[PDB]
Design a protein around this ligand. Structure first.
Ligand SMILES: *C[C@@](*)(O)[C@H](CCCNC(N)=[NH2+])NC(=O)[C@@H]1CCCN1C(=O)[C@H](N)Cc1ccccc1
Ligand SMILES: *C[C@@](*)(O)[C@H](CCCNC(N)=[NH2+])NC(=O)[C@@H]1CCCN1C(=O)[C@H](N)Cc1ccccc1
Lengths: 48, 40, 32, 258, 52, 44, 48, 52, 258, 32
């Protein structure tokens, strides 16, 4: 075990494309986005 | 699994977490656009 | 490069003021 | 920035933001005046008193921000740097005399609708628009009160904050302080008998004491939030560096590298 | 329910400790995205129609 | 890299392609042992 | 902040090449390796 | 220093929380590898020669 | 296993290692008898007393392990499972009568040097080999001591452990046992006057009560470490299910979905 | 599958016994 989001420094504009997100995480967002997009879809279809 | 192979030593090739996010960043936003726009 | 500086694209270069652009002017000795 | 209003959009396309890589600290506002150069509080870089000797590879700047916090995708630009260029004649010992510093960029920045450098002072304009009672605008995400002691309300801002305050005659600035007064230094606030309190505060430093030129409606930062004996106390005024006068050094530096 | 925590989906810890947690592949993800795109735009354009 | 006949999925919309740490891990450990092998031996 | 190596299951061999390393981590493992090799390389280049 | 703590090299935190930490692309890595190969190969074959 | 020995490589190429996704824990031992089927203690999967109703999605088997812990890079094969089949007549309530559970592979497994299943007992060899005093080996990274009480020394093995012991006549079994014996159940140990401790222990279930065929020198596991009152005790012996007698069901299961 | 089962490639298939592969034999009434 260990914690405090390690000991990393910020990212520079350059960094993009030479350091990418955590596969795991991305999905999570990827998932999350859709859901809100669906329930909210459910919402429209249903409320109307 | 492999199909995008481009150097057997390194096997199949995929996109980048980077290329993905942006695709989302583009993806997601345009989505909401039409949405919020219709929500009105 | 200067001779292009101090020009707000959403103001001075597309004509307009900030919510209170009067103040500075109106603060010059007395109002405009 | 005390007693102010959640600033508008684009007001300051020069409003640079100095950030501490590791950890993530918003140390000072900066002064954008070119795709590869920026003005900033020397003090903001190194204040031995407060033990401060930050270097290029220690701090970075986020150009064109509105929110102190939330990223600003597509728009927000944060470039690395090249070499900081402090003023040797920078004396913090006594009183931040010449508290100010210029700096280069590892890689330029693309001035867009949100990005643009302020105009540098001209001799005329110089002494020209720098008269007591003269209201001027300046900005820095800087705090807003006296944080480390009893204080309610709120702590730091969310969106850049604006300040439009008048100039103050040297003697007033002089008697209102226990710190050596300079010909480059200069405060400015709102006397105990006018109404509008407010003034710069902790960390708002490195910002630009902006001033729009009448002659051509061109904007000009003619001061650098140097210091302030507390945060907006009636009779007490924030002081700002003196670009124009100090102006010399700066160019000489630019004239050799940029 | 009032601040915000990040979502880290599809992760499994690799039998080898040193390797630990394994995150989805670029492809793996890229694939999923377009998986939502097709049905997505459909229902999107599915709106407008009824809207006009 | 690729164009089409090399892969069966490719999508430009997701930008340029690169390996997978899986792919690398394998290249490390393998690559890595080969080294030692020679090392180990030479060591004697 | 948060900790206990979160909440994930063990990966099945089927997983590999569908669930890969965490970039940052990799490089470290690489850097680790090579170094020992170096020093050990110098350790031999030197003994002679 | 009795057990073993895995290595976590070259990375940075993304301006956006939701992205946070960003690691070496495969490409970065790959290339990073071979940049150490060549030197190694020499250092190695440069033994034998002196050994025989 | 109690009083055992750090077994050598390959003697157990059918020695499966049942594991729990979350948290990753080794729950039992299993028995490799085919690239898609594995035999083991039914209780290991389901035990309400100690509340247990595990399912494939919940656990997987680590095939060909030596070290009970450290991975076995390029060697140890780990496969998720497919459909878990347990014999309906398995009675945990009373005493684990027919305590035995079988499983199918979500995806087959390739037998190699370390990978390979045990042969299945035939009628002949059946009762043929089963006899008092006849020793038999089994295998499991299970325990070695009385877990929750006074016990020091060594607790959990580092690599599969060795264990060979004689087959015991029912009487002995029945008398020592306070549990309803079965023709399906059966003990085995070292009586008090021979001098060789050791016995199946906590977690060593699902294991293989191995026995080599004198006939064609092949290997036959004939009993699944079902249970035992305490770990290795004078008068106490582990009990192990009776493969063949209950082998029928076995075919029944594979014959259908194999 | 079977018909090839019960045999150790590191013993059976390549001829050889285990540290104590004899004991079982030896337990068959009496030794070999
Ligand atoms: C670095 C800036 O953030 C900070 C601005 C704070 C000003 N606050 C108000 N309300 N005007 N600058 C400073 O704090 C400067 C530099 C470090 C010292 N200093 C001060 O403001 C002191 N309070 C006064 C002072 C000390 C030494 C030299 C000059 C001024
Ligand atoms: C599940 C196995 O791993 C574990 C191994 C140890 C048992 N015997 C020996 N000799 N070590 N088996 C058990 O714990 C079995 C099944 C669950 C209950 N159990 C027992 O041994 C009980 N302690 C006794 C018992 C009572 C009723 C029915 C069966 C066993």
């Amino acid at each position: 075990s260990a914690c405090k989001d390690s000991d990393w420094p910020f990212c520079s504009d350059e960094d993009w494309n030479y350091k990418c997100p955590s596969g795991c995480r991305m999905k999570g967002l990827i998932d999350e986005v859709n859901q809100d997009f669906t329930n909210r879809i459910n919402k429209l279809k249903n409320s109307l | 699994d492999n199909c995008c192979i481009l150097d057997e030593r390194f096997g199949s090739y995929c996109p980048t977490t980077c290329g993905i996010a942006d695709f989302l960043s583009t993806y997601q936003t345009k989505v909401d656009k039409d949405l919020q726009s219709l929500e009105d | 490069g200067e001779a292009d500086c101090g020009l707000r694209p959403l103001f001075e270069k597309k004509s307009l003021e900030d919510k209170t652009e009067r103040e500075l002017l109106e603060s010059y000795i007395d109002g405009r | 920035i005390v007693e102010g209003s959640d600033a508008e959009i684009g007001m300051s396309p020069w409003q640079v933001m100095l950030f501490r890589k590791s950890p993530q600290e918003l140390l000072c506002g900066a002064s954008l005046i070119s795709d590869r150069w920026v003005l900033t509080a020397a003090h903001c870089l190194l204040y031995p008193p407060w033990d401060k000797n930050f270097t290029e590879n220690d701090l970075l700047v986020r150009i064109g921000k509105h929110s102190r916090t939330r990223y600003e995708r597509n728009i927000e630009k944060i470039s690395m740097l090249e070499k900081i260029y402090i003023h040797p004649r920078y004396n913090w010992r006594e009183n931040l005399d010449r508290d100010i510093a210029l700096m280069k960029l590892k890689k330029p920045v693309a001035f867009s609708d949100y990005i643009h450098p302020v105009c540098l002072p001209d001799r005329e304009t110089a002494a020209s628009l720098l008269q007591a009672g003269y209201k001027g605008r300046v900005t820095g995400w800087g705090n807003l009160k006296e944080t480390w002691t009893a204080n309610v309300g709120k702590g730091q801002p969310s969106v850049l904050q604006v300040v439009n305050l008048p100039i103050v005659e040297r003697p007033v600035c002089k008697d209102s302080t226990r710190i050596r007064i300079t010909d480059n230094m200069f405060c400015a606030g709102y006397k105990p008998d006018e109404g509008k309190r407010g003034d710069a505060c902790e960390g708002d430093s490195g910002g630009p004491f902006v001033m729009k030129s009448p002659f051509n409606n061109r904007w000009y930062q003619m001061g650098i939030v140097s210091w302030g004996e507390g945060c907006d106390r009636d009779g007490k005024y924030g002081f700002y560096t003196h670009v124009f006068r100090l102006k010399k050094w700066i160019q000489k530096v630019i004239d050799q590298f940029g | 329910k009032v601040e915000r925590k990040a979502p880290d989906a599809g992760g499994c810890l690799h039998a080898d400790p040193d390797l630990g947690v394994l995150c989805p592949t670029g492809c793996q993800l890229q694939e999923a995205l377009l998986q939502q795109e097709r049905p997505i735009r459909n229902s999107v354009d599915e709106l407008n129609n009824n809207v006009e």
